[PDB]
Ligand binder design. Structure first.
Ligand SMILES: O=C(CO)[C@H](O)[C@H](O)COP(=O)(O)O
Ligand SMILES: O=C(CO)[C@H](O)[C@H](O)COP(=O)(O)O
Lengths: 216, 216
């Protein structure tokens, strides 16, 4: 089972604390949502410490559709409305229009270029004109309340940054097996051991936020 | 130089003919745009013969942002308007809203799921309701006239299918080096030898279409 498989990463509180410390150290984490939801594990990195090598790993090992999780306030500052008015995706994934840094990039898709765009968008002083649309980074609007309002990786990403005392922006991408199928828990666990990345779940975060009374 | 490097794939007419034959055989090709444009090589596959293994290779080896090149007529049939009204991307890349098959998929990102979405969208009998929006496949509207009107990989993709007598839909994705930088011509050539994929350029296609008087 999953509870049993994740036991070696510690108990739920420990899994959360280890993930937060990894982010504070500039390392990535692996976040699983509910088994009855997507049942997928995303690599998560903080934007603050994001490097080209970390983006290259996401591209190499994940779906390649690398998303930028923002607060509603930051997406509003950037003038990024939802990509679609009537979202009928299964989870109502909150894609805004896609973005490219207006300056400092070329075609936008290289690992370096994606980082430039992400840092440009996540800048607390950013303005809409700093970003061209469309582009090759995919922002996502986290719901107010985080994982206590919506049990998505989007909310998990922003909550992890806030809980770790980091600027409230992170990137995510779904871990993919070489044959193109999506990684499930055993493969996620093995990837996290290989890359020294903590694994935790949305359920871990929810019970952690409830018990420590963690508004954000 | 590039002319010299591609000489081993044949002369320009031969490079085009070999690419067309590969597509007819269900194989992929590598298309380079102008050195002074993106200077990137895209893997191209025909939708008609697209397999999970081909999609997995694109995800593994390319940017992961896999695009579906459609005619204007097919995008209109699907009710896919441009993603952004005032496109200010550098090349005015003609992204529509992103799409997911409404049925037959789960999270949409697995290689199989992307193929299901692509085949669903490319179906000559498709209807808008067959696709959820947003999603994890990125359609692109090819300009009328193809590479004789716009020298993009988008037009190259649809033109190649039409020139090969295939249904006029193809997928593309930018070849990426493991370190996250974008592949340039020497790496593209080496990838095409490794994977038995012909390499050709947009310039090859333009002069080919002009000289053989090829409306499409
Ligand atoms: O679609 C996705 C990104 O492209 C993934 O599902 C991502 O994990 C965000 O979605 P959510 O917040 O719904 O879990
Ligand atoms: O952005 C892209 C896809 O995401 C690439 O540039 C793609 O090759 C299509 O663009 P174009 O037709 O302008 O060459």
């Amino acid at each position: 089972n999953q509870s049993s498989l994740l036991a070696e990463f510690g108990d739920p509180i420990t899994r959360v604390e280890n993930a937060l410390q990894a982010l504070r150290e500039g390392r990535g984490v692996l976040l699983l949502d509910d088994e009855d939801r997507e049942n997928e594990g995303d690599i998560i990195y903080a934007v603050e410490s994001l490097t080209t090598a970390q983006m290259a790993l996401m591209i190499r090992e994940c779906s390649g559709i690398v998303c930028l999780c923002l607060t509603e306030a930051q997406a509003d500052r950037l003038a990024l409305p939802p990509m679609v008015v009537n979202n009928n995706s299964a989870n109502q994934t909150a894609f805004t229009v896609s973005i490219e840094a207006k300056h400092g990039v070329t075609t936008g898709v290289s690992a370096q270029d994606r980082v430039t765009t992400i840092k440009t968008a996540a800048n607390p002083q950013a303005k809409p004109e700093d970003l061209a649309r469309p582009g090759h980074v995919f922002p996502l609007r986290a719901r107010a309340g985080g994982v206590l309002a919506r049990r998505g990786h989007t909310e998990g990403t922003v909550d992890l940054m806030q809980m770790a005392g980091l600027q409230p922006a992170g990137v995510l991408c779904e871990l993919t097996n070489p044959d193109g199928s999506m990684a499930k828990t055993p493969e996620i666990i093995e990837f996290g051991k290989l890359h020294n990345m903590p694994v935790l779940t949305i359920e871990d975060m929810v019970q952690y936020r409830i018990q420590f009374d963690l508004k954000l």
